[PDB]
Design a binder for this molecule. Structure first.
Ligand SMILES: CC(=O)NCCSC(=O)CCC(=O)O
Length: 361
């Protein structure tokens, strides 16, 4: 075995996905895994439909929205601006966005937004914004700072989509271009992603995986339905492109001749940035404590999980995910389109994949 992987776990992995597709849980599924930067196993299963067209075959290069995985693109963009000297992680947000110059918001720093410790709630409610344009940058900011904060800074890890929308606004301010234009040129094109778009062109729109009508409606829209940018969600991508992003991190910023970050910067992003003893919250409910870097998740890893300590990851509704084990030079990315979450459908295959890892040779 050149990649040193027990290929019977591939059969167990395919059968696990194929069982849920035959039971009606999943419509389709796809994955891709690599050892030492070389993909040795990749499969696509099932069919998809948005409820109108007939069923199309799910493919390995099928484009699909990655949801919260867009946050990793935003994190790279922020850390690039730090490498250039235009941003600092300890910068108070009120320095760039003077609307934050008020009690509570005045102590929110860029480090707090990257690590979900800025005290912001999960999201802004849109029913109270009647009369104001939620997708306007100037309007959305004033409505945010007119809403009370959940906690003060450094009080708890609270996953917030609002936090990364602000980062996309800060990126737009210090660069002179929009967040979408910056990420497209300095990340998407600089890394060589061939099937990654903030907005899918018309000629490729028929090859986008959609499992609901509201996914097809959003497919033809030119802006996020209620955010001034797409820094928290809204990126369409493929398995190979998500695999390239994970491999860029495992190689500490390089993908052969493509360089996105410095070696020392990625080492900072993969370090635990949360104060000890802080409580964790995801969607109001408590969560199990875990490491978290500069926009990168260091949990789950170790403990009862098979993933080695130091494995970094990030999930996204869809569902989707990328998992990279630096100790094993191993990477696993997957697409599991489903309208909600279920760990048996999303996180159980992690036990199957890592149980096949043999000693690298
Ligand atoms: C940090 C953690 O535990 N889960 C984050 C991935 S869940 C997701 O997709 C949130 C919805 C979104 O912002 O698109």
């Amino acid at each position: 075995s050149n990649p040193a992987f027990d290929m019977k776990q591939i059969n167990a992995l395919n059968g696990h996905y194929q069982t849920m597709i035959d039971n009606g849980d999943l419509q389709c599924a796809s994955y891709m895994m690599s050892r030492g930067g070389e993909v040795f196993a990749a499969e696509s299963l099932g069919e998809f439909t948005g409820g109108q067209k007939e069923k199309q075959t799910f493919q390995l290069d099928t484009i699909r929205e990655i949801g919260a995985l867009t946050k990793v693109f935003t994190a790279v963009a922020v850390m690039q601006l730090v490498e250039k000297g235009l941003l600092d992680l300890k910068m108070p947000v009120k320095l760039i966005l003077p609307a934050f110059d008020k009690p509570g918001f005045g102590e929110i720093k860029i480090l707090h937004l990257l690590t979900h410790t800025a005290g912001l709630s999960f999201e802004l409610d849109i029913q109270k914004a009647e009369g104001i344009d939620l997708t306007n940058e100037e309007e959305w900011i004033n409505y945010l700072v007119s809403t009370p904060l959940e906690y003060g800074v450094d009080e708890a890890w609270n996953y917030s989509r609002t936090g990364f929308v602000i980062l996309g606004i800060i990126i737009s301010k210090v660069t002179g271009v929009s967040y979408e234009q910056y990420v497209t040129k300095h990340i998407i094109e600089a890394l060589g992603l061939e099937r990654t778009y903030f907005y899918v062109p018309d000629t490729l729109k028929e090859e986008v995986c959609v499992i609901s009508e509201h996914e097809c409606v959003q497919l033809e829209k030119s802006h996020h339905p209620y955010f001034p940018n797409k820094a928290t969600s809204g990126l369409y991508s493929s398995l190979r492109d998500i695999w390239k992003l994970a491999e860029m991190f495992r190689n500490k910023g390089r993908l052969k001749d493509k360089k996105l970050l410095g070696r020392k910067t990625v080492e900072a992003m993969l370090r635990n940035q949360i104060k000890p003893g802080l409580p964790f919250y995801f969607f109001g409910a408590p969560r199990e404590e875990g490491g978290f870097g500069l926009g990168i998740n260091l949990w789950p890893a170790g403990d009862h999980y098979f993933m080695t300590e130091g494995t970094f990851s990030h999930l996204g509704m869809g569902w989707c995910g990328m998992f990279s084990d630096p100790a094993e030079d191993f990477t696993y990315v997957f697409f599991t389109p489903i309208s909600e979450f279920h760990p048996h459908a999303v996180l159980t295959p992690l036990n199957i994949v890592w149980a096949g890892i043999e000693l690298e040779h």
